[PDB]
Design a protein around this ligand. Structure first.
Ligand code: COH
Length: 124
């Protein structure tokens, strides 16, 4: 068995090398969610046009890997809900994504940074 507690958390995806909004921010839903599940913490986020995201990896500011788990795939809406393993106090994530839109031959790898509105909290 598992027990889980959650609250909303907002964020903005910003450009590599910059504090500017990345257009990647438009491809994730807002706000996200922080979940505490069996004393483990997740940032739960919804990817828009999920079919375009060929690969994605998340890291903390110190380059540690943050495992992801798929919790929903909605074919009709073309969305994917994922949990990203995080820890209380995290303020930003680095993301590396491989985006492919084959009808327009768009095929690119990007690094961005996802900035939480406040640090991931401790939850009860
Ligand atoms: C998951 C995020 C994501 C998706 C789904 C996506 C899918 C799509 C898509 C779908 C049909 C279209 C028409 C575009 C069109 C563009 N993308 Co993106 N790209 C995305 C993340 C990026 C990133 C990252 C950049 C680099 C600049 C930035 O905004 O961070 C980018 C840059 C662009 C640029 C160059 C402008 C620049 O500032 O360099 C065009 C044009 N785009 N891309």
């Amino acid at each position: 068995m598992s027990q889980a507690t959650s609250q909303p958390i907002n964020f903005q995806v910003q450009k590599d090398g910059s504090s500017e909004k990345s257009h990647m921010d438009d491809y994730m839903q807002h706000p996200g969610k922080v979940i505490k599940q069996n004393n483990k913490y997740y940032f739960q986020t919804v990817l828009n046009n999920a079919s375009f995201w060929k690969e994605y990896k998340f890291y903390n500011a110190n380059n540690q890997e943050l495992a992801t788990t798929v919790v929903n795939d909605n074919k009709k809406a073309d969305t994917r809900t994922i949990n990203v393993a995080v820890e209380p106090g995290y303020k930003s994530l680095t993301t590396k994504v491989h985006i492919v839109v084959p009808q327009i031959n768009y095929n690119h790898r990007y690094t961005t940074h996802l900035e939480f509105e406040k640090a991931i909290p401790t939850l009860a």
